[PDB]
Amino acid sequence: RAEHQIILPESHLSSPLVKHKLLYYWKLTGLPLPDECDFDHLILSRQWKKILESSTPDIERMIKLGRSVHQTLSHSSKLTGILHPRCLEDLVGLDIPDSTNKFRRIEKKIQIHNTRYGEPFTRLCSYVEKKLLGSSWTHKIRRSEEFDSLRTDPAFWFHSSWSTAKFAWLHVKQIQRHLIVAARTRSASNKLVTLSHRSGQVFITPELVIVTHTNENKFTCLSQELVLMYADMMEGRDMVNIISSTAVHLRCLAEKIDDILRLVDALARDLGNQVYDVVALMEGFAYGAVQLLEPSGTFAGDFFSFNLQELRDTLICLLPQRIADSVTHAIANIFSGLEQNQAAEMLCLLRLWGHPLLESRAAAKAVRAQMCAPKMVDFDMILQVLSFFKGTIINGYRKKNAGVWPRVKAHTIYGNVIAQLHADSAEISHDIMLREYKNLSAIEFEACIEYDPVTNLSMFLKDKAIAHPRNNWLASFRRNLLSEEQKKNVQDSTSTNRLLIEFLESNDFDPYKEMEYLTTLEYLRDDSVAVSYSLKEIFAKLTKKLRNCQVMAEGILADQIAPFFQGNDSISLTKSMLAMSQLSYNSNRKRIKHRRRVATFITTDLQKYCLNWRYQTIKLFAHAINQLMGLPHFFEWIHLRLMDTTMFVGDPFNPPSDPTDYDLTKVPNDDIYIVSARGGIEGLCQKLWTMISIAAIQLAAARSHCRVACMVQGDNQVIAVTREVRPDDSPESVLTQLHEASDNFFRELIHVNHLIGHNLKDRETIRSDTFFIYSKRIFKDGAILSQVLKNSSKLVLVSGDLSENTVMSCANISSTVARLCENGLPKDFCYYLNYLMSCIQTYFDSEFSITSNQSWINDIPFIHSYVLTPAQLGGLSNLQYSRLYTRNIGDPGTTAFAEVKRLEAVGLLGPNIMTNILTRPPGNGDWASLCNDPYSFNFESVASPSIVLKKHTQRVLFETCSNPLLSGVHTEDNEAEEKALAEYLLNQEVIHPRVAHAIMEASSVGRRKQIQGLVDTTNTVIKIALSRKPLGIKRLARIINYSSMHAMLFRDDVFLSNRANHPLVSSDMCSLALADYARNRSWSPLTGGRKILGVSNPDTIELVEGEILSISGGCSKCDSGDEQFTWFHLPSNIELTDDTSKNPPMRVPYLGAHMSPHVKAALRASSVLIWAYGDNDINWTAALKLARSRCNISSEYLRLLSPLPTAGNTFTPASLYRVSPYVHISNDSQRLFTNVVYQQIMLLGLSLIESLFPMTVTKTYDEITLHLHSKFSCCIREAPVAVPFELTGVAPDLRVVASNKFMYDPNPV
Amino acid sequence: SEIQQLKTSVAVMEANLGMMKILDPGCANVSSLSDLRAVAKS
Amino acid sequence: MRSEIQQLKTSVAVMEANLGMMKILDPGCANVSSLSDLRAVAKSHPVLIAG
Amino acid sequence: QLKTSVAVMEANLGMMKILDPGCANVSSLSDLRA
Amino acid sequence: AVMEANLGMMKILDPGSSLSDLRAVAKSHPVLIAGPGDPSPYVTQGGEIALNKLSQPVPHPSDLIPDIGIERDTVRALILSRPMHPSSSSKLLSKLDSAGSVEEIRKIKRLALNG
């Protein structure tokens, strides 16, 4: 069949490693188990004499596999059954010569790719660098030796250490995925592939892979997602080897990494599964080697010595003492001698041995030891934290509501100090919060906050699992493994147990009646509530009503109460964190009362944070928020429910080991159970806990008499303790005051967390004068510290599971290579690296496929010109050369034609391809396709499989939507309204796709698209919606054959064509003339000859013609009559190391109401519609009829509320910031772009500045000045004449329901 | 006066005894919209 | 004056009777609570004690 | 009056610790509801 | 006055290492049972409760109760990784293998971090 080739097996590890799945399939064959599984609690208790008589195919494959494996081993010795991770070192050296010779066929073609095209890549990179840096820098344009090592050794992926095992495990992985796909079909094919490696064999089935070593007479068994873990770690550590041995500032790491890998492999043979207690310390050794480089003598080598002592203490319990000493010495010599970036690069050693095998019993023991423990918290410290909690609430409400306190009960205002602040409504200071805490903690509020239960609506549309209730909890496990009276307590489940689908189908959903599950205490009478815990190393599974109330409570806190505490989001988190390490000592030392403030940093992680909160600690805080909302009982629900319920760690292969467990209220506080838990669950009730943590941090600040800038997202807290000094104050005094302030604050933070029941350590928390740690990135002296090797470990070779998609795989390669280029790599190296890895990708999909292409896969110029042509035009390349310098904001079509023009000029891409793109036959095309996706060409293309499956599940899930919230989302004529609106907006005298995209996005049509795009279409949701409604025959053949159709469409349209009807424009014109010609020709069957305009933007590299000035100054452009440029200056003699006594001042570089949002969207549509087409009565009638779909305003309130007509139609940093915080920007002599274009020029200039200094450079020596001249460009055009007119025709009806708060606003504004 | 300070020192006693009472999970039907002196005096 | 002193004495007399009923721990563990206090309390609508 | 109030303060407010005797043993949920 | 007639102190021994200083610095508190359960495994004959580092009562208080390899490896890491003149770094590495105690390694650690 063909339905089974849609949702493929996963090619990468997305799940934990359950031990008893592996041991189920191990026991199901007749092989001996490992010797640490002789007294196992689940294996010795199941009734295997009935399981093995099921005669399912899943058991017959295992029995035939055991007769295959047992026949090859011998009876002269003992067959051993070594379990992961005790077989890391043997599977590390796995060497199948049948996969080596199958990857050498790819290597043989990549070497021809280099020897035919490597010299035009050199010509391209030198061309673009000579254009952007001028011909006065032309004695400094050499290719980097990263690029030259990539140019002499094309098979970097094939000739490293770890490459043979990478070949072997990728071939084993693709064979097993093919066998799973074949085993979906009910057939009788031989589902057993036997490979032969160096001294042994490999047996592959859809469930197990068995590796047998015949001289040692041993074997190991690996489950479905354990061969994925081995394949992932092999290509990860291989790519880490490649990048660390090519890059010059990383070559000392490479040997170290091999050492630190192989040593720990040798530990895994006799530590076993506890070797991941060693691996977990490796992160610490990367944080302590940064703290070796302190400016003072304090803090240096404290966390390093702590982790070295912890490593000795974990080793001496399992190893002999001598081997523990020698291994500790080896770990100490690996992480010593590193730079500031090379120490942060060793954070790649985390996922590089993979993951342990998990079980439910040990996880449940680890949870019971801390969540069922007794606690004793201090009442007076709860009063102090509650004082700062309520004072922060009062000050935040005062700031939000224009100087008014919350509605406080008048008889609860004690003393004369708070009673005086109440009359003035004055902002309460932290010193009054500490002094008057007995009077401020005892204050009560009244209902003065109008909340909203359903606000986000994306949190109710998540694919979260729902636990089926506690009379059916034995449906959590696989029915094959239950006992005979445990099978009688399992019922059928009509539900899907997903939050999304059971939210859509739940009619009579009233949020204010769903909150009565908690305010009326009916969640606590309810004897169907079950909580299920999950295997991990952050997630639980609640029932339907309780999950609804948890989502509501989180939304209400994050919407109303949480911004009172400021939470202390991508550019604004590299401006609040990059400016937070500007306060460090080494950031302002040339500058060095109350004049200049400095800070020293404390990154703390609390021991077992979420499951040490008790009801006795959180009750008064929840009480305060309940009084402030008007709720009798809302925000303390989790502790009261978990005290009264029993929960279990749920896993389908981990049943209860006692076969007589039927009722949860009668199982002991034992095997998988946590009976009457007293702590909290992670993620649940997170906002309240973050607010209590902020209140404790500000309390510790006030109790130690200092100011503090914190940032806390749960157990990860970062505090900058601050101290204000003089410019003429000595540096020794500044360091002494910072050390005393950090000591006093850290003691008070220890003290106020110990008394409310929490532990942050004296030694595990990293205190530092220099760096802090946020989102696992190290921020150090106003700079982000590099992580190229982490991104190298994810440079992998299959992406996604929805088909055999090569375009999305090459797109993931391009995004990872761009992220490598952001962490500081040569541009030419990353560009030619993406070419070579995309060729590896496109040859790995003709071979090694688990599911025609014989004509074009042996065509080397086709594969070249197909991986190098941009994806906007039909090729595979999602990395233009301009993406190496800056972000892709701008027009994708002009950047596409600009890259094609550069590649044609330097000799890479042929002359035929340009004229064949220009003479390309047009596609189907709609007005709706031009409105929904502007910047787009009407070329014949195949739709992406992920877009098709996502859109199919969004259309299928909303067919059975029935709740009163979001009732008008799925209408029967939304596509007719979409076509009518797009034909009204676009089919005018002047065609504007971008303003029509803005109008339709601001109307109710785009609101329906925006609501339907919020649903979580994961693989399980797509399987459900394809079971409820099949996909078809034409669309499904386009899903399965997507890559072959995409490649043959490139081959037919633009690679192999005659095109005797030669176009008007030639290949030498500007790229926006080219993109305008391609749009005006491609949309010509739809449009009819009119000019699609208002779309194109210039490419930033093609626009400017840069120049670096000489020593005397003066540019060859401004000597030739040029005045339009941006000016970039870098001061001389800048240190990039710790000696920052003579650096120039560092600053943050350049990076980039009171109404309902329905009225905002309506007024935005009004502003865009009047700005773009004209300002008279017909345009205002159309603007009224479009704004009337989202709100209930009249005609006269449009004209006095619409904004003025304008052009408005760290997780991943933009770069490292080493020499860009010193550059000075003057956009003064350029007056044409004073807008998006000058943003592009400024970002291109900063990337060209920081491109001049590789990571091997720590000192500048001269002054650098750029003039980005853009006057004598072919791509300069004056803005046209905006000609107003009347919109012919009438606007569509755009019907709307009035009951939706999510699509409509009935209040007359 | 000292009596006016004893009033506001005696009042936070009941406001803290009501706090100690509502920390008990057996006081889970005490609605939050209630005076803590009144919870203490009951 | 004297009336406020009488109300202070009466309020402290209420406080000593309230501290006589709380479950203060002593060696011997006489006044403990079970998990059935919450179960008997949750069977009704949450009550208002204010005044 | 000034002495018994501070005697209630020192043993009521400043010195008061709050015990949650969590069920760190092996017993079922219906055994804890007894 | 009449205050100690009802509130029984319980002699809490927070470690804010032997049993003597735990008994010596141990303030007495009136602890108040709020949660359900039995607190009897955590008190001791004499009325004393020992708390953990997480403010957890412990069953018996004795749960609450150098090296040269680590101290030489860390000072090698400080000499190797900090900026230092290469003759002086080799001189500090020269008189470090000749050490024989925890003392005179600390002299090099305060000799390396101070220059």
Residue numbers in the entry:
A (entry chain A): 8 to 544, 553 to 583, 588 to 611, 629 to 887, 894 to 1194, 1209 to 1265, 1278 to 1302, 1310 to 1384
B (entry chain C): 264 to 305
C (entry chain D): 262 to 312
D (entry chain B): 268 to 301
E (entry chain E): 274 to 289, 294 to 342, 350 to 399
What's the paper's own text on this?
NDV RNA genome is replicated and transcribed by a multifunctional 250 kDa RNA-dependent RNA polymerase (L protein). The L protein consists of the N-terminal RNA-dependent RNA polymerase domain (RdRp), polyribonucleotidyl transferase domain (PRNTase), the connector domain (CD), the methyltransferase domain (MT), and C-terminal domain (CTD). The P protein adopts a unique tetrameric organization and interacts with L protein.
After motion correction, CTF estimation, 2D classification, 3D classification and 3D refinement, we obtained L-P complexes in three integrity states: the full-length L-P complex (Lf-P), core L-P complex (Lc-P) and core L-extended P complex (Lc-Pe). The final resolution of Lf-P complex, the Lc-P complex and Lc-Pe were 3.41 Å, 3.0 Å and 3.25 Å respectively. In comparison, the structure of the Lc-P complex contains the RdRp domain and PRNTase domain of the L protein and P tetramer. When we analyzed the Lc-P structure, we found that the solved regions of each P monomer are P1 (261–301), P2 (250–305), P3 (259–312), and P4 (274–399), whereby the P4 monomer contains the largest number of residues built into the cryo-EM density map. Our structural analysis showed that the P-OD regions of the four monomers form a four-helix bundle. Due to the flexibility of P-XD, this region was only modeled in P4, where it interacts with L. Analysis of the complex structures showed that P1&P2 (P-OD regions, 261–289) interact with L, while P3 (260–312) and P4 (274–283, 308–315) are bound to the helix of P1&P2. (2) On the palm subdomain of the L protein, a three-helix bundle from P4 (351–399) interacts with the L protein near the putative NTP entrance channel. The R356, D357, R366 and K393 of P4 form electrostatic interactions with E301, D309 and H336 of L protein. In addition, L362 of P4 forms hydrophobic interactions with L299 and F306 of L protein. We did not identify any close interactions between L and P3, because the P3 monomer interacts almost exclusively with the other P monomers.
